[PDB]
Design a binder for this molecule. Structure first.
Ligand SMILES: CNC(=O)c1cc(-n2ncc3cc(Nc4c(F)cccc4Cl)c(COC)cc32)cs1
Ligand SMILES: CCCCCCCCO[C@@H]1O[C@H](CO)[C@@H](O)[C@H](O)[C@H]1O
Ligand SMILES: CCCCCCCCO[C@@H]1O[C@H](CO)[C@@H](O)[C@H](O)[C@H]1O
Length: 348
C-alpha cells in the first residue's frame, strides 16, 4: 500500500498516493472533481477523478459500481483506459472515496474547435477515431450516451480518446443528445451515439454548434428545423394519439437539403452526415457501417478496428442493499491490475 497525502484544491480534499504530485484542477463537474497530476512513477501527466459521494444513496452507489466496471473493461486505443484505481481506505468499513486515474490528454474538442478551423483531412481523422472507439464500445453492448466535445480529447498528434461515459439509466449539455433521449422513448438504440457523432462532425466542419438549444423545447425545435417533422413511416411507430396530434399540429417542416446546409464541405462528408442525422433511429448508420464509408477511405483498416470482450452487465438488473453495492465496488478496487508499460516506454 502506498503512502497517501492530503491536500485541498478549490475547496475539495484530495487524498492520493505520493506518486502523484503537482495536483492542479482541470474542472469541477457533476461526474466528479478532476485534477491534473504528474505521475512520478511513470513520468507521465495523468487525469485523476474523485467520485463525488459515491455511496450516499442506492442510486449513487450503483452508479459508482457501474462507472468502475465500465472503465475497468475499456481497453482500446480511442477509449479512456484506467491506469490506476485507489482509495485511502485501509478496510471496507472505512471505504468512502474512489479515485480513478487515466492519461492526461492535451486538449478536449471544445478547445480545438475554438483554436483552429480544421481541414477536411483533420475532420476525417477525428471522426474516424470516434467511430473506431465507438465500434468497440457498441461491440460490448454498451451505449456511451454522452458523446460531446468536452468528453473527447486529443494529443499533439490528434490521436483521440472518448472519455467519461453517460451514467444515467432508466451542468450537462443537451446540444449533442439524440431527440429520443430527450423525449423519454425508453428503449434506446446504440444509434443515440451516432446522432451525437453527427452533431460533433457538423461542428468540426463548420466551427459552429449544430443545435445550440437554449432549453429542452428549443433543442427539439432546432432539430426539427434541420431534419424536418417526422415522416409517415416514423409516425407509424408512435402509440400515443395525442403525441401524433401534436406533431401533426406543427407547421410541417421539410427536411433541409444538407448539401445546402453544409455548403463547401466535402460531398462525402455531407453524405455521411445525412446518414447519421436521421430522426428515425432505426435508419441511422452504425459505427461499423460508418467506418466503411468512403469518407474514411484514407484511414479505414478492417483489420485494425478491434472489438471488445463480452461485458457482463447483469448487475444493471439488480436491486441490492447499499452495503452490497459498496462491497462489490471495493472488491473491484482491490482486484484492479494496472496495464503493462508500453514497449516504447522501455529501452534495450
Ligand atoms: C492539457 N490537457 C487538457 O486541457 C485536458 C485533458 C483532459 N482529459 N484527459 C483525460 C481526461 C479524463 C477525464 N475523466 C477521467 C479522469 F480524469 C480519470 C479517470 C477516468 C476518467 Cl473518465 C476528464 C474529465 O472529463 C471531462 C478529462 C480528461 C480534458 S481537457
Ligand atoms: C407531445 C409530443 C411529443 C412527441 C414525443 C413522441 C412520443 C414518444 O413517446 C414514446 O412512444 C413510444 C412508442 O409508442 C413508447 O414506447 C414510449 O413509451 C413513449 O414515450
Ligand atoms: C417524434 C418526436 C421527434 C423524435 C423522433 C425520434 C425517433 C427515434 O427513432 C426511434 O428510436 C426508438 C428507440 O429510441 C425506436 O424504438 C423507434 O423504432 C425509432 O423510430
Amino acid at each position: 500500500r502506498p503512502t497517501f497525502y492530503r491536500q485541498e484544491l478549490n475547496k475539495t480534499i484530495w487524498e492520493v498516493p505520493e506518486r502523484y504530485q503537482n495536483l492542479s484542477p482541470v474542472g469541477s463537474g457533476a461526474y466528479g472533481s478532476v485534477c491534473a497530476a504528474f505521475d512520478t512513477k511513470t513520468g507521465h501527466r495523468v487525469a485523476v477523478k474523485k467520485l463525488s459521494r459515491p455511496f450516499q444513496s442506492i442510486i449513487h452507489a450503483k452508479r459508482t459500481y457501474r462507472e468502475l466496471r465500465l472503465l475497468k473493461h475499456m481497453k482500446h486505443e480511442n477509449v479512456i483506459g484506467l491506469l490506476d484505481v485507489f482509495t485511502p481506505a485501509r478496510s471496507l468499513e472505512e471505504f468512502n472515496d474512489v479515485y480513478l486515474v487515466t492519461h492526461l490528454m492535451g486538449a478536449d474538442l471544445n478547445n480545438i474547435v475554438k483554436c483552429q478551423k480544421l481541414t477536411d483531412d483533420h475532420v476525417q481523422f477525428l471522426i474516424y477515431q470516434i467511430l473506431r472507439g465507438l465500434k468497440y464500445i457498441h461491440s460490448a453492448d454498451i451505449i456511451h450516451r454522452d458523446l460531446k466535445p468536452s468528453n473527447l480529447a486529443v494529443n499533439e498528434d490528434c490521436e483521440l480518446k472518448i472519455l467519461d461515459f453517460g451514467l444515467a439509466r432508466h451542468v450537462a449539455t443537451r446540444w449533442y443528445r439524440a431527440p429520443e433521449i430527450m423525449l423519454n422513448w425508453m428503449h434506446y438504440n446504440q444509434t443515440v451515439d451516432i446522432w451525437s457523432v453527427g452533431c460533433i462532425m457538423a461542428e468540426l466542419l463548420t466551427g459552429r454548434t449544430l443545435f445550440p438549444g437554449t432549453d429542452h423545447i428549443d433543442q427539439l425545435k432546432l432539430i426539427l428545423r434541420l431534419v424536418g417533422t417526422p415522416g409517415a413511416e416514423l409516425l407509424k411507430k408512435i402509440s400515443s394519439e395525442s403525441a401524433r396530434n401534436y406533431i401533426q399540429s406543427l407547421a410541417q417542416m421539410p427536411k433541409m437539403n444538407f448539401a445546402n446546409v453544409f455548403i463547401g464541405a466535402n460531398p462525402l462528408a455531407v453524405d455521411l452526415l445525412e446518414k447519421m442525422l436521421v430522426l428515425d433511429s432505426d435508419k441511422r448508420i452504425t459505427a461499423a457501417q460508418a467506418l466503411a464509408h468512403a469518407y474514411f477511405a484514407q484511414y479505414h483498416d478492417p483489420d485494425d478496428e478491434p472489438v471488445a470482450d463480452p461485458y457482463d452487465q447483469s448487475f444493471e438488473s439488480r436491486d441490492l442493499l447499499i452495503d452490497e453495492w459498496k462491497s462489490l465496488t471495493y472488491d473491484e478496487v482491490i482486484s484492479f491490475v494496472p496495464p503493462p508499460l508500453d514497449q516504447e516506454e522501455m529501452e534495450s
